[PDB]
Amino acid sequence: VFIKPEVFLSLGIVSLLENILVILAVVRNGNLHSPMYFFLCSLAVADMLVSVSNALETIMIAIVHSDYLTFEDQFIQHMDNIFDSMICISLVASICNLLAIAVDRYVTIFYALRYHSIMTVRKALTLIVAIWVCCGVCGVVFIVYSESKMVIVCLITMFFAMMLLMGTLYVHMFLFARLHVKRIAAMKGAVTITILLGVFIFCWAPFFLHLVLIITCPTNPYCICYTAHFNTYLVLIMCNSVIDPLIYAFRSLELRNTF
């Protein structure tokens, strides 16, 4: 039920290192003005945000546990509201970037000839800016405005919609690749698809399954001892932030070479 902040700090620092390496490898090399790597950079920034926000909140809890007390009520609430807003911004940013990468891959494969005309650099930057702006607005509103309300419904519906969308896109892409394998012959895709979708689900679904229980069955204990390891779900989300550069940017040969 309780987690020592040592693991929180370790996960935060390791995610910071990996995302710094990813950003440096992207910026240093000539892998620029290709929308493939802009989304990787945006996702790395969002993962860094989740990691650092959680590490800072744990260190603040540890410090203000017993000493260094400034004020009783106003200061503590004021200081932790901004941390919670930062984490709520970074969660949505991470999910939206994971989805934007999938949509980009789908467009490259199923619009192979008309690509480079329906997705330019200007459109990639517009998309990134709009995604981050909307995510920030929602992350502020979901905390500073009363979160003891029905905002959780809109918080879990959006996650389930993006999960279904990602699954559909990647399954169609793999099924299409199977036809090409058949035509060549007349696997790798399964492993890749299972890794991507399993990491996504195993890291993100437990938290939102925790969320749905507190608004559906908050009193009955039938499979409600589920919402007692609530901190392990944050641990898993930071684990996702650690893993994301391993399966997205470090699979690229050029990014491997530069770093």
Binding site: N54, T58, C88, E147, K149, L211, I214, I215, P218, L234
Partner: peptide, 12 residues
């Protein structure tokens, strides 16, 4: 005020 790790840790 009670300080926790992230919002929605106990039912509203």
């Amino acid at each position: 005020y009670r300080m926790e790790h992230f919002r929605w840790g106990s039912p509203p």
